[PDB]
Amino acid sequence: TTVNVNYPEGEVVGVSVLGIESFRGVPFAQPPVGNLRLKPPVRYTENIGTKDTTGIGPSCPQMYLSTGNGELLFQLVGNLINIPLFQTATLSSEDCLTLNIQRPAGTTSNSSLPVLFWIFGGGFELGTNQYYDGIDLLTEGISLGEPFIFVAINYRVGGFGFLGGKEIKADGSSNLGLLDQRIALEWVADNIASFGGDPSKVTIWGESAGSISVFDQMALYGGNNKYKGKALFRGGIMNSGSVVPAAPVDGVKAQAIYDHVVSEAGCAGTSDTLACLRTVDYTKFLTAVNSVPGIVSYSSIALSYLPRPDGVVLIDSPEEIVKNKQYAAVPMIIGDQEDEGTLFAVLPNNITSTAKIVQYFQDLYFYNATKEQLTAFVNTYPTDITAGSPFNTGIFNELYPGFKRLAAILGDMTFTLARRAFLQLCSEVNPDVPSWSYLASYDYGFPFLGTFHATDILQVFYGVLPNYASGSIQKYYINFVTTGDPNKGAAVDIQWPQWSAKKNILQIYATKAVIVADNFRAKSYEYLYNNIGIFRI
Amino acid sequence: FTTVNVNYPEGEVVGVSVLGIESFRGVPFAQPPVGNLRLKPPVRYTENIGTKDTTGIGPSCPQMYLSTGNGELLFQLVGNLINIPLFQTATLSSEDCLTLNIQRPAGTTSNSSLPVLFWIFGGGFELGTNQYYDGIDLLTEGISLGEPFIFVAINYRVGGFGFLGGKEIKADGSSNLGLLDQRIALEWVADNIASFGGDPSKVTIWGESAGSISVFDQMALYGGNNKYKGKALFRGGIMNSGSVVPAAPVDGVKAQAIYDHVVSEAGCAGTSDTLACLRTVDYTKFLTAVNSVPGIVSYSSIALSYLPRPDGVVLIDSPEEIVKNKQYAAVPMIIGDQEDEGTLFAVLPNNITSTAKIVQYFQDLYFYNATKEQLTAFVNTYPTDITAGSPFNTGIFNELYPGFKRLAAILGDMTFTLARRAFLQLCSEVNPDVPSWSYLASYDYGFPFLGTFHATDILQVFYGVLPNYASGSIQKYYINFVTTGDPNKGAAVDIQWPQWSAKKNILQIYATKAVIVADNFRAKSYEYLYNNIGIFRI
Ligand SMILES: CCCCCCCCC(=O)O[C@H](COC(=O)CCCCCC)COP(=O)(O)O
Ligand SMILES: CCCCCCCCC(=O)O[C@H](COC(=O)CCCCCC)COP(=O)(O)O
Ligand SMILES: *[C@@H]1O[C@H](CO)[C@@H](O)[C@H](O)[C@H]1NC(C)=O
Ligand SMILES: *[C@@H]1O[C@H](CO)[C@@H](O)[C@H](O)[C@H]1NC(C)=O
Ligand SMILES: *[C@@H]1O[C@H](CO)[C@@H](O)[C@H](O)[C@H]1NC(C)=O
């Protein structure tokens, strides 16, 4: 059972399964290939005709594992995965600037439904909309009387989306993944009504790197989120990630990354290194950008690829963008999984003392923090086995001596207490703009990892397993997309208090939720807030 | 959704008919080895099991993918997380796993009398199940060649549920349970397969890796007595990657240490009857305990914690001695190897980078009955030149780390590829009139770092991916063999596969062609292994 949409730019053949029409792999910009590799995305000028989108869309090139750093087993797999046969088997190519659109059966151009615009996460190195199907979430929306359009996009990750250095900067080529996101937003503004969505009711939603991207979209161009005189979105939902302090795109880390990629791509000593890169064949290029340290490794959260201030797209370090009121402030929901850091403390298992955590940070994370400052920060975290993450689990879950501590720290600085700082600053500069925040605990007891990073994809995005957490959060979100307030629309079980009222949040278990003070780990949070700037990665 | 019923001597099962093939998955063949029957030989059902729905996916026996107590921390972490009940349930894995799958052409009845291909999965005696070995592709090919058969794929217990050893296990008569599961499935087939349209006098057994070793062990079982109710349980064997595994006894030092470790982790140390105590341990804790020892995915690599070991009754002696003593059921047989058997297993032990280090590694984990002088002599038959090692014939390429291609060559040769030649040689000496055919697979030549590596035949041959000369010729040879007892008789073949003992030639099969070659490569290493086989008892 198929279904045509015609829109200004082309038309589209989707599938209608159990009450849901799905269009997968709708092109939104020109394939960033040859000429257009390592260049900003470009809109389609001419009509692109009729594409069948009853299939499975492509992914952008992935970096699951480094081809040049980390344990040999991982390097081996990292290289094997890059061979054409596998790239082809996974539908991954530079031809990836496509999105998916899912809607309830029978929706028409006449329809004026709210839009839910999803940005996947994968440490800015991997990820794709291929395994983010909005069926369960849209199904709940219909069951609640609050139907919506679901849009899930691809964007360039790894060295295809976030290569930096002085050359990229001058080419105006910084932060391509963000621009892919932005241009996907503008495409939605031009085309989504044809699909029966209200382009004036777009809510952007992301997890991890996608959540950070949500804040970045709010920040883009000094907070100018306007397209043809109208805002590109009206609300934002952030799961695990917001502001990421970061040195400039032409900074030392990014330049070192760029020079290494250029060496591996076989482009050193050439006249235009950046021009040369676009000459290198895919496989060789993929291998070279993937050669740097990857998230699955000792390096962990000290990412090789991430958004960095360029001065136009990302005008400044995100924390300063907030303090200076240079972001589109919109109603927003932000949350964290209770144990965000555990996954990221698994590999750096030789970091087992304050002194070693400090060295680790000075080696890879924070070039503009003194040994003294970092030592102070880490010392706000007890060595006490019981104080670490997974939180509230006693002497248990210590994978290695110092694990729960490191997990606590990595999880707080990057996501959970970072979130509170974000909330605090936003409440100060834009007090009239509402926010709601929550903590997820529905996997309490899960050995070693607890309610760890990305568990929300299962429990919330897919509703597995079906329980109080699944119902409550889904309903809050769908409410928020519909009304711009999680407590408005369908009837809610607990009134979610605005964060700036008392600085309370919802803590959501499998069985129930409760309102609690967002003041845990106060000394750690204090130091981070008062010293946010030294934490630029 | 079309169903088909089969009544047979022990019950009735309902299967599914799909695109010309009928499948019955999860047919019970022995009582569930749970409670008092954990760590006991399997027992046939003594009562009719009634009517069973077998139109879904069957279970697996408990798996050991990764050790819970040894190896890198990431692997221990994952090894532990995999064992939680939620995941065991999601993968349909539990102790109640003695079931098998039967697939046959649509329209087959009890009068069809088709030959039977009986498949034994490989998984290093630590993991594996019939769940992902669906014979649809092979049976489809059989049907298109006018040589239809019944495909039977079994579960058997692995890891500490199937190959736990030590003197307590030995005295209990509970050695080598996983081999007993395969054997009791063969007997179930003898009694029951005619009801499904198969001919029990035409059973060919086939396995890859641990399953291939298991095929030879089935020929070896009970001093070579493969008879049941007066009839042979199989008439042929196909061995992909593995045969004879010289091994110290089930009550030897290695096996006892594993047992003592498991008992202590399971909380049974010091009890009056530790083995009886193990049977009372809760599944999740028992699983964690048996999986606590070193796993194949680690530094220990192919120095396995679990494998068949001589017990004096089921496996009467070390396999090489069984062959020399002519105490195995000698059947027509096909045996092959992937060209680069060792590459996968040399990835993890990447600090083993010199002759001296290879020997220390072997002395420490592998061969307790080999001297340093002997092991050094064996290793010295392998050149240190990058071009000599595995992936073979790839020159200066594929050196994952210095010494890798060499370690890969040694691991693959001693365990699989030259062991195969020694097996063929001994068999031709004591049973000269029993035919054997052998081949080397090179259809993945050029694949980076691993070459035509261990288990690549699961894709190319078992599933026929991708369709090419290799899938075509091997499937046809195997199907001919199942039907006629000779890979060359049945459907016309492109190349006449010579019997091995005639001139000691084998087929070498590439993706697009095959050639006859001499089975005499790496002669010096072979010669040493052959003349000193007993020192390589693992
Ligand atoms: C094959 C994967 C299936 C995962 C099921 C997800 C369950 C999530 C939740 O809804 O269930 C919850 C929690 O599940 C467990 O904490 C383990 C989940 C681990 C998640 C990552 C693997 C139900 O448990 P319960 O509190 O007993 O109701
Ligand atoms: C979805 C991908 C898996 C199918 C692989 C096919 C295997 C056999 C052969 O036909 O393939 C190989 C494919 O390439 C490599 O040599 C081997 C692939 C490695 C697979 C191991 C995971 C056939 O090559 P060709 O001669 O080009 O047909
Ligand atoms: C820990 O291991 C990493 C490699 O994963 C290494 O770079 C670092 O120097 C080591 N640090 C300590 C303190 O052992
Ligand atoms: C080693 O050989 C002896 C006889 O010399 C034998 O009894 C013993 O079982 C062997 N041990 C191993 C490891 O096979
Ligand atoms: C190699 O590494 C393993 C694990 O790190 C270690 O146990 C073993 O002693 C090493 N072997 C050598 C150096 O021969």
Coordinates of C-alpha atoms in Angstrom, one line a residue, chain B residues 27 104 108 123-124 149 170 185 243 277 288 328 334 343 349 362 369 371 377 387 443 463 491 498 501 513:
Chain B
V27 CA 11.8 -30.8 18.2
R104 CA 12.7 -31.2 4.3
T108 CA 7.8 -35.3 1.9
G123 CA 31.7 -22.7 18.6
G124 CA 34.9 -23.7 20.3
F149 CA 17.6 -34.7 1.5
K170 CA 34.8 -38.7 35.6
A185 CA 20.5 -37.1 18.8
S243 CA 39.3 -33.5 13.2
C277 CA 26.2 -29.3 45.0
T288 CA 28.5 -17.0 35.7
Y328 CA 37.0 -45.5 15.1
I334 CA 35.4 -35.4 3.1
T343 CA 44.5 -15.7 11.6
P349 CA 47.7 -12.8 21.6
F362 CA 52.7 -22.8 24.3
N369 CA 53.9 -32.6 27.7
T371 CA 59.8 -29.8 26.1
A377 CA 62.2 -27.2 16.9
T387 CA 55.8 -13.4 3.2
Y443 CA 37.8 -18.2 -2.1
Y463 CA 24.6 -20.3 3.0
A491 CA 25.0 -34.5 -10.4
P498 CA 40.6 -37.3 -6.6
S501 CA 45.3 -41.6 -0.8
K513 CA 37.6 -21.9 -10.2

